[model samples]
Target: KEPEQLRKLFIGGLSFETTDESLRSHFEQWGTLTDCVVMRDPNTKRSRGFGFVTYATVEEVDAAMNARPHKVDGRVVEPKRAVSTVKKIFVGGIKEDTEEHHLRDYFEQYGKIEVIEIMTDRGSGKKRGFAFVTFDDHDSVDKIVIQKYHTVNGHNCEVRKAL
Candidate 1:
């Protein structure tokens, strides 16, 4: 079997004011960048203070990692490997009214379902606008990662190997 592929890095500790152009500008100095995306809130459309940067090559990724003190607005930014292989994914940006069955139905196309969990507000008993879906195998996780990790549903959803 082949070794697991190196995962891209998700840069956090970004300034809320940071933009995609700004991120690109900073990271481009390290190497060729394939994509730089700053995540934003779905409803409010505000920066989520985090982003993902994809380098053109793994060597470039290593170079970026070595250049420490990658900062913006005086805050030290850290870039860590984004989760790739997974059995579960945390899905956010669903309407507050969405339920477990609705969420499960949406993700069932990828593979066999293990479980679906919708977090609710303890006080209001309303959907917390997010949920978790678990799949039976890594293939299913990869399918979803390819299909919806950074696209579809107008929001970025991430998959982690566990939890």
Candidate 2:
């Protein structure tokens, strides 16, 4: 969490059961909410399956994102910096058999693994040769990227900041 500044955030994966007021109150626990609105269809006033939650500072945004798949109405609430300033790295060229645990084992010493989204091919249900890795300490990512020492089963790894 940053020490100062407000931040606009994009929140998704909402269950229609969640309401703007509920969303507001849930995130308000972290800090002052400059704004919180659940997108809704104009006609029915129903949720559009997504929403935005704004915090008074970037720190608050980090707080919410790091809640680690924060939930609302039992559904995993995914909070992303509307601006996506979050520190994240894209790891590619992953071997077909590489698992989340493998990536964790290699990078865990740097910092806490906040999220690891290994992309996959739809038809074959196999890895797409890439993944997005997030760490609790964004600074830690630089250490991995700078050295560029990625080798999995003799496959060269692609480690770089998420664009």
Candidate 3:
């Protein structure tokens, strides 16, 4: 028989205190995790209490969805389908000291900031000079792209309606 294809599960209802390492530690017991991330508040540098987890195989993800222990820190984790319809712009060339609020402050001028997240080094917990900014609406994203794309900070940045 052939092996089943891997599945990606969007995990939600996380705690504001959850970290990527902690998330991995919790889900690893279920199966091999292809990728895991804890959503964060871009400006405050805090977890938004949600994340996404992808397993190496469909069976692994299925097992995790069906199993218990989805709750951590008194929060129950729920799994859902991954949606790519929303527009997500990748903001690069950010300063190393850039915080989530700074990014949100700038992007929020375009529209309602749905989610703002900055990539940080796990070891040092420092900003990685980049972030993902998700807008509340697609039209707002387009306007931002035209007016402010590559116009923020002192660097020439890039913004695209992420796939």
Say which candidate scores most in lDDT: 2
Q: Which segments of candidate 2 are over 4 A away from where they belong?
A: 1-6, 84-163
RMSD of each: 14.2, 9.6, 16.6
Tens-digit lDDT track of model 2 for 90-162: 8888867778887888777656888888899889988888888898865456446655388754668988888
Quality of model 3 by C-alpha lDDT: 0.70
- For model 2, the local distance difference test gives 0.75
Q: Could you arrange the candidates by TM-score from highest to lowest?
A: 2, 1, 3
Q: After superposition, how far is residue 51 of candidate 1 from its true place, in Å?
A: 0.4
TM-scores, one per candidate: 0.47, 0.53, 0.45
Error of 1 at 75 (Å): 2.1
Compose the digit string of candidate 1's lDDT tens values, residues 1-163.
2112333668889998888889889888888877888999999979999998888776676677667558965667877655645578777777576666666666776667998887788999887877788887544565455443533244454444455
The all-Cα superposition gives candidate 3 an RMSD in Å to the true structure of 16.6
Number of colliding residue pairs in model 3? 3
Which digits, one per residue and each the tens of the lDDT, describe model 3 over residues 1-163? 1132235666778888888888888888788887888988889879887888777775576567557547765678766544423468878888686678777777886667888888898899887888899876554465455444465556567766665
Clashing residue pairs, candidate 1? Answer: none
